[PDB]
Design a protein around this ligand. Structure first.
Ligand SMILES: CCOC(=O)C(C)=O
Ligand SMILES: CCOC(=O)C(C)=O
Lengths: 407, 412, 412, 410
């Protein structure tokens, strides 16, 4: 009768470096990377927790955590312990020694709350999911551990940690990036790919992490140490994302993105410019809370022979002034100033960027606050572009202020 | 050394009906009228008080006040009394027996004011759009020894005819007060201008309390500052004028001191649509004197479709969050939060209030569209003046105000 | 799988006058009355809604709602609509509009409710003190297929005479409703007990809007849930009782399910003073079902003087913040925030509301002192029944309610 | 006309170890130490900033700053940048701060976007009330490079201070660390100016000064030892008298400033709040001290028979305290303290959530946060049994921590 969420604590692992994002994550953690025009990546796991009815949240951070922590302080500031809500920011010769460690080192903060269930979450994915489903499967299945999994074509699973299960979705082995991924019994050509989401009873986990602290062998991670141990010595069960996913009617399939490369990151944002986007950012039934300030509305100015400030097939945030600049298939975060005779196409423009007059840019991700010099051309000369900026094989240039200065 | 604002309470009169705004205020007070894409009118006086360092605010409401009051409860909710801040929402009888006037609006609330014991009271009109630093006006008030300091616009005399006008001597001491003078008295030194009352009054609090008690005890008083309290002091006390230009907070992108009454639909339309200029008279992108309001986290603005027949786009326009511009042409328009403009529609010279829906093929020009209106598909406005005058409120200059009740009546 | 509370709106009827509480409610509505040292009565229904996971709450107020509305504005200010949460304060007057009854209180505000489109409405009285998890009642409602679920106390029949009583069958289906039955029908199989309505009702929103629109067009209706809406469904539709015992959130340290009307001065006094017990019926130190309220940061409680003639200390008492007990003796008393009790004074069996000041040498016994009352030096209460009755509101059991207007008229 | 606080930013140095406070700062920085019953020491500087009209605040922290950082996030969370308000918590994002100067230098990246005119450098480990608008007004007028807040102290007590030589217009002509013969004030000998560690700068000037300091690989990167000694000698340093800006309540007999540097001083400043006429008026609503506070139940006193009586005399007691058959005298209790039957506290400062077991009897103590006092424990009866059981000062105050109690089998 009583929702299990009332007795759950969501614990967000937010230390992921986002290595392959290169300069995008040079001074910010992957979960602090901007997404969608208004939010950051971590706001999704956090909003899922909130919307699922989980009132206690812990967030473990590791490297380059400064701006991630300031985001959390500014945006996620409305929890009060007298309402049995909490939001603890838990930063790391003093780092965490893995994903399991960050729970272990913080037991003293967890146990006063004494939650019945722990919902361990990866904070660097973009998805919407109602965790109450997973909680209910967990208590009703008697599992030691319930693991959230995507169903992906066997070929795609080769990059995931893959769970080998049986006909009752109990997990019988785990393999990191199996090159020939174990298929679902009775449904080959599909594999169960781990989402980095783990539901525990709280007391089992506590011991499970104590045990891990003691063992010299352990790399102190959930994926390699905690879980496989459980898989081999206890009862592990799979939960399928399709069962819990909160998809809008206007989302043609369950949405989940890792945005683990500049290409995947650029594509995921630019896809929001579609007539029918994969992600329905207008689904008010499952809203994404974030840090946002009061801003002026977007402004478009100039319209004559040679210049017209306008956006077409584009998404534009507040505090943006589009002055004689032509935008197409671009997403602009808050605060962008684009000036006369400049042009943007296939552009993901992060907060507070200035585009100088006459600049022309195509297929780019422009980093936070970058000032684009007047006249710069990107997307015309693949080879000059690759020398000046971080350019992908697909031809997306990631542009940072450091890159511009060296011009 | 100490700023006087620490010792002041701002008391905002927010019962303005905005009668000439017609259907725009049939269900809301004038201070609750939307402006500029995000805020409401009352947010300017409150942001002035905040930015000036005043920590205690009272707001007296009168007619049609629920949405104003809701706005205040939700947007102005961050003042804490044990930090010596306060924000009091004060409707007629206890959050018949209406306020009998603006002075009554204070008098009835003496028991709210007195516990705070502020040293000064700043009486504000909540129905004007303007930026002002009240600390200068406080300074002048104590340093001049006046009974009342009155905020005054310095306007050419032909404009002052619709204002309450203060007559000036050499030292800017007010020597009489005229309500809407046919030929306004001028300022000594430079004739050609007049001092028009802003409805801003600074008192020593104790002085003010005695006045409103005296006004309450006068059986022939109409119970207003403008008509009753102020004329009494101008004569039998010391009234002094403060010049708006001296306290006005101008951005360096604002060519002149900005103050707007938006007392008519043309004025309302004109003040909003002027924000679409390359160089508007009001700088809303300024940060050195910010306007706080009630704002919700919204998805960004979206523009879509780009084919032969339809292009979602905004030109020389201002567009807010949660707007979806789908195959619709926007030109010289101001869109508030939550507008959904649909394929093949067109908007020119439009002020479009929150949550409006523009149906496919609809074409609207020179309009103000009320909050939440659902424009039916294919509707045409701005083309047939007599038909346009027939179904909607239409001004002499050709502006159409459109409400849902007007749309509901549509069959011809 | 999905908790029904996500889909419910709580609607709190906070218009109780508390007539029998006499002077205690001469300027405040009953839901605004102080309870327990810090909170107000309305905070129990609101905290129940919040703890049950209901994110949308409306409060309908009626008479003397000034201080109630103020409390709700400052205390219950943390709901944000973009997180699908909302807190609407819905005063009977945007004067002329008064709600015609508890049913009119909803009907007039349909245009506040339907935009949120909740699936369930939970109608609550805002003037009782109790803890209850409404998810239990929601589930029963959807499982039972009923048109209304009604929350009911299980009370011994001779105490049931004072209540609105539902007749019940073996399936807890309500076959009749009786207002104050001289002989309350017992529960089948459990005579000796009867079901008393708590004035708590769960509906599907679509059904409730239907019923409310039917009621408004019926000119004979008293427009109340109690007299009109519920009895109509009882005879013509499907009403089922829900047992408070099943939903009540009882602490380990509460010997039974706790519910209190505090309808009389004696009952009010009794319910507060009971908190000074070694083992109170109400466990306020519970953290598993917390009661939220408006609270300010205050200094701690202070106890001073210990000489031969005066000692400030409290025995068998509960004392809040900002209290200074200066050479004063407290015994079996409950003090709200900001009480100043001065040298040589004594309080016994006293419920003392916020900001009360107790003058030197005063000695008060068996009292309720209203908010902000200054007790003059040397006043004696609880010594002479006839004198105390002449001066104050004295109950049959000898409880004196003391208000400042009673003190003002005094001099023996 | 325009108050200078509008253009100022307060930067609070909150990395003090409070080394002499021993186990009381075992796992927390000094600014995080509880004071007065409901607040922490850092809240005083912060409330001074806010009350003075300084709506931009940064806090630099160093060692053991977890609870300090949590307190700040929870309690000081009401600033919004779009109202030109900001509160930045700046932990050491290797590379600890090199000193209080380095604490500023690393965070130029945080400061410049706000571009304030003035920087008000504040020690976050003192208890005092001050209106910084006076010191700002003096600084801009004096035309000096740095203005330094100073206590006026009798020279006999100035020997334990950083003392500023002054001339007849309060220009600082020397700074001496703990002078044996502290230089006296011109025409007011017998009083010396003792630095409060409060400095006012122009922001541009301070950025240069901290950039120069960072370049010198020799420097100890501290305002006290490096930057301030450089300005007196080569630039323009001027003193600001605490008495000139202190916010002294009518019920405060003298300007109040406390360092609470030692266990005895900490105990003394807290227990002094139980006085009939305390030196610190914690009721002056005119200059209020904001902190992190939760809604809690009122304090409760229960039991009253021949053998036990729950009550407090000459005491200060917070919310969520249950005094159950326990007798308190001259004690200050923070939130959530449970004292059980037949127990007795005297001259006791008891930090939050402490449990006092039945029959326990304690005198002259500071009990650390959350400590559970075993039933029947006696402290303050036997000085030598106490000094080996707990940390006991020369004056006879016992600091009791949980790790000390856990060692008990004598
Ligand atoms: C807060 C941002 O508001 C906006 O004006 C848009 C366009 O998103
Ligand atoms: C805010 C907590 O207040 C109290 O209950 C006491 C006694 O300080």
């Amino acid at each position: 009768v009583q929702p299990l969420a009332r007795d759950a604590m969501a614990y967000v692992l937010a230390g992921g470096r986002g290595s392959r994002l290169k300069e995008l994550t040079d001074r910010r953690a992957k979960p602090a990377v901007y997404f969608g025009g208004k939010a950051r990546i971590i706001d999704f796991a956090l909003s899922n927790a909130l919307n699922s009815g989980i009132r206690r949240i812990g967030v473990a951070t590791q490297y380059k955590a400064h701006s991630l922590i300031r985001h959390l302080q500014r945006g996620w500031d409305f929890f009060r312990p007298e309402r049995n809500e909490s939001f603890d920011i838990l930063p790391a010769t003093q780092w965490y020694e893995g994903t399991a460690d960050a729970v272990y080192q913080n037991i003293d903060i967890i146990e006063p709350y004494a939650p019945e269930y722990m919902v361990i979450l990866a904070g660097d994915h973009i998805y919407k999911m109602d965790y109450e489903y997973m909680l209910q499967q967990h208590v009703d299945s008697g599992a030691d551990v319930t693991i959230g999994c995507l169903e992906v074509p066997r070929m795609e699973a080769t990059g995931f940690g893959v769970m080998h299960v049986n006909e009752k979705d109990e997990i019988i082995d785990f393999i990191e990036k199996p090159a020939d991924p174990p298929g679902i019994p009775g449904n080959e050509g599909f594999a169960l790919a781990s989402m980095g989401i783990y539901v525990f009873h709280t007391k089992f986990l506590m011991e499970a992490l104590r045990r891990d602290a003691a063992d010299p062998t352990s790399s102190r991670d959930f994926g390699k140490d905690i879980i496989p141990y459980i898989v081999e010595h206890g009862k592990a069960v799979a939960h399928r994302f399709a069962d819990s996913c909160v998809r809008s009617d206007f989302e043609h399939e369950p949405y989940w993105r890792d945005v683990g490369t500049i290409d995947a990151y650029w594509q995921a944002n630019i896809d929001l410019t579609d007539v029918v986007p994969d992600l329905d950012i207008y689904d008010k039934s499952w809203p994404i809370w974030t840090y946002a300030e009061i801003t002026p509305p977007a402004k478009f100015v100039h319209d004559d022979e040679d210049r017209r400030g306008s956006a077409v097939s584009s998404v534009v945030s507040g505090d943006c002034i589009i002055s004689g600049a032509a935008l197409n298939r671009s997403l602009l975060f808050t605060g962008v100033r684009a000036n006369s005779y400049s042009r943007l196409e296939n552009a993901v423009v992060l907060p507070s960027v200035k585009i100088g007059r006459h600049a022309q840019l195509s297929n780019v991700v422009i980093d936070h606050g970058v000032v684009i010099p007047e006249g710069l051309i990107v997307g015309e000369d693949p080879e000059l572009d690759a020398k000046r900026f971080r350019r992908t094989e697909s031809g997306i240039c990631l542009i940072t202020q450091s890159m511009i200065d060296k011009l």
